[PDB]
Amino acid sequence: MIELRNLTKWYPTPHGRRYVFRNLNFRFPDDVSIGLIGRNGAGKSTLMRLLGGIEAPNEGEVVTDVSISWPVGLSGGFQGSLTARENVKFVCRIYGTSHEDMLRKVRFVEEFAEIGEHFDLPMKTYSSGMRSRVAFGLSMAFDFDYYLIDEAMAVGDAQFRAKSRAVFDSRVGQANMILVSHNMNDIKEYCDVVVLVDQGQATLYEDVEAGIAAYQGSLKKAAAKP
Amino acid sequence: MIELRNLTKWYPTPHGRRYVFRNLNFRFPDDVSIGLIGRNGAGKSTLMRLLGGIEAPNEGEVVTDVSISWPVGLSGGFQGSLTARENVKFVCRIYGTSHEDMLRKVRFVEEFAEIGEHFDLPMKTYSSGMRSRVAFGLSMAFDFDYYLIDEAMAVGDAQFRAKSRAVFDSRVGQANMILVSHNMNDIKEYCDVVVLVDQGQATLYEDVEAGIAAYQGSLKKAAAKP
Amino acid sequence: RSPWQIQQAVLFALFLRELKTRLGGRWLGVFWVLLEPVAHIAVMTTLFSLAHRAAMPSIEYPVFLITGLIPFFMFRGLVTRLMEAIDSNRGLFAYRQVKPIDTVIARAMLEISLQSIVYLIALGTLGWLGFHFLPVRALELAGVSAVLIMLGASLGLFFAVVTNEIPQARAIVRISLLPLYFVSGVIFPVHTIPPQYLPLLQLNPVLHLIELSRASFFPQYRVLQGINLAYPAGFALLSLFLALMLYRLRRHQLAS
Amino acid sequence: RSPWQIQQAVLFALFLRELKTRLGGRWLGVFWVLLEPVAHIAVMTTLFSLAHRAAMPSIEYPVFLITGLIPFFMFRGLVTRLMEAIDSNRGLFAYRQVKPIDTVIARAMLEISLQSIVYLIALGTLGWLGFHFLPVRALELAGVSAVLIMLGASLGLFFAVVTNEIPQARAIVRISLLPLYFVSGVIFPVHTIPPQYLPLLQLNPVLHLIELSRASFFPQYRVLQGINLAYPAGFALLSLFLALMLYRLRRHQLAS
């Protein structure tokens, strides 16, 4: 149960306020997978950041009673000086995890990363793929009711892609995902409803193919404009 | 002519020195395209960085009489607080390029990037795609004898990828390329010889198909190990 | 999930985070945070012992210098580490349920605990050398120390909120702190300077706080006129109100 | 492509690169860097004018204070910005033909040029106020300034090479610099301190350099015994040789 009430997000620019969302009120459908689609720069990343708590909306708010994940695979929240074990310790300290649970989770993350001795090395001493693996592990760590994905299914090598897909299919049926992908096949496979974001407005389609056709028609109309 | 003489590179780990290369001496074939292939962690990326001068070898040296480029699309060499025009100007001063040449270099990068007013805005406000675009433009700005790619064909959108592919097709016949890609179709299309990296040793195959078969056999042998 | 509970949890997390960063990676930060006071002790004792003997033959130099130097060190540490709290953990606001004020108060409590430990250690090693360490009036000393701590934390928070998106201001306030070492009269007794420049020096709240702390710590210590606690107390209250108000106004803009 | 031309090009690029960072983006760093000396001049003139009049009735305070303060500012700036040169541009080492020594000497030349500008401006505004600004012996002053510059740059390079992969040392050398402000006798004439602590203070090379600069700048300035240029000159030469040798030994590890 997620609602955006009077959501108005804008960015400060030298030419004025660049409005991303203007008084946006929208209720997400409950206990279903959601595919967030739209044009480039339409605000899908901004909407996901607002949903995940990364960015606080200027006006209005996001009201939810279920756990909403941060963007999966986001390595920007880490500290370069801290190690992976300390980072996941701080992350589970945010959510008030018990000692036995966080210990096991830490062991689970260390097993999933398949990083080894570097697990005890700081984030700064990490590669992009290594950071992506760690971020994916901590994003799938907490049993979130909603998982936010923004092109995180194409990170890592082939083996990590297969492992992530296998674990994701294991999590299918136990949690709902909000996925932002330019590939419509992924939207068809992993989403039950479609939310199209355009001109600061969100439109809900209970049929995936109808929303895909609407997005393609919007793209054609934009391309036909001289 | 590119040669690695006594190249010994290791990684500092708490359990000792994680050696990547041990007394590696290898001569690259001249005026041909090279496909650097190998297993994950075999040492393709670090060898590419050694060729590009990003990281110096612990022992030995690299002797070259031709220009070797940095990893194309790498945004790690930029300054977040400095704008793209001053960044490419600084890179021009690095190679000692004349004022008129720097001007066009700047104009060429600005026209290829297709970014706009953000071209006068710094990289700390840039996204991943914007950084990839400006890095690609600064890479093509100089006429290198050898261009190095590590999965740089999957960056950007479809239009940017098509533009980069067309530019590199126009470039083919004027300069050489070392490509590190897991897709062997690109190796067959773009590379004339194959260099397989395994256990700190580099093996040269004048036939691309023979090198691909050797790498596949090595993968099968590794998978068959209990 | 009450707001106080999650606030306490994130404060404890942020607190130990600042600890790990401030203290050495090999558990060695206690060495330098104990070395900073003793060097100043040595140089001021070798440079101004006879001057203090000519000043007053009642209080020996080491205890009198410590009891003013450690509060000043706490004040300068509070200001310096508090003003840099927000622009040091910019990658930490990505997670929700966290705020910059949590980081600044975690740094404040870390600095308070470290300087309290240093003060207790200095008092212990002073009493181990046969000097006088027991405060005659400890409640007034505690109140003065609380006022000084609040003033320092308030000034640090004000400088953190105001000088966002302009680091250059943080460059100059340091050079504003160096004369404050000598203006406050922590090293030498203020009873020696002629009154011709006293009215300009009475506007320093930390001066009043240091003299009042010394008066409450020592038996029969003469405090000169116009060293009331009312002026630094009002300064601290007004600055704290202003800083909290400015943080509340620039709340969402601060975290980015 | 001889190494000298590419070295000059990368030096110019690094220099202007540093100039952009050190100076404000609004071209206003000169305002703060001109505010730094005048505040010290004001506080020392309002705090020690009559003491200097009692010291000697021959040289007025402002010029005597400037001619020692600005070289000390150059020295401390050289040390501070040179010790932080390598661990500030880690990414820029990705490009070939960059090296860390180019960064440290670009910062050194930027600091030298900026402090030379500040010195010329101070001399101009001193001569505009009717004081004495023209050096009586400029060649000896230039030689002393060159020796001081070489010593400062050498010490900065030594601290940059030695204290790699340990930032904490960079935290303590700064606290070593604060007593050096008073030890060197830049503020007050050294002729007043009793000889009982002179020899321990004769081991500071910058003290000898400052007195020799003042002697070469002023007509009929009395220099006390044991202020030979040989000791600071040998100190600077030995430190420069040691720092260059240590950098040559640890070359590839510094680049990382």
Tab-separated table of C-alpha atoms in Angstrom, chain D residues 2 26 29-30 48 68 85-86 92 112 122 127 140 157 160 163 178 185 193 228 235 242:
chain	number	residue	atom	x	y	z
D	2	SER	CA	62.575	15.415	-25.206
D	26	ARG	CA	35.045	33.508	-8.221
D	29	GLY	CA	41.295	33.738	-2.927
D	30	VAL	CA	43.607	36.757	-3.035
D	48	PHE	CA	53.410	44.405	21.576
D	68	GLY	CA	60.018	38.250	9.125
D	85	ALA	CA	50.486	17.205	-2.733
D	86	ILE	CA	50.772	13.489	-3.508
D	92	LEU	CA	45.619	12.121	-12.142
D	112	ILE	CA	56.350	30.695	-4.188
D	122	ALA	CA	53.005	44.396	1.444
D	127	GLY	CA	56.141	52.372	1.195
D	140	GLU	CA	72.148	38.752	0.554
D	157	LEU	CA	58.842	16.766	-0.115
D	160	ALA	CA	55.180	13.843	1.452
D	163	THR	CA	54.274	9.790	5.495
D	178	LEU	CA	52.356	26.120	16.050
D	185	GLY	CA	61.289	34.758	17.238
D	193	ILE	CA	65.070	36.613	25.676
D	228	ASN	CA	75.748	31.796	10.664
D	235	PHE	CA	70.492	21.612	6.957
D	242	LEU	CA	67.723	12.882	1.804
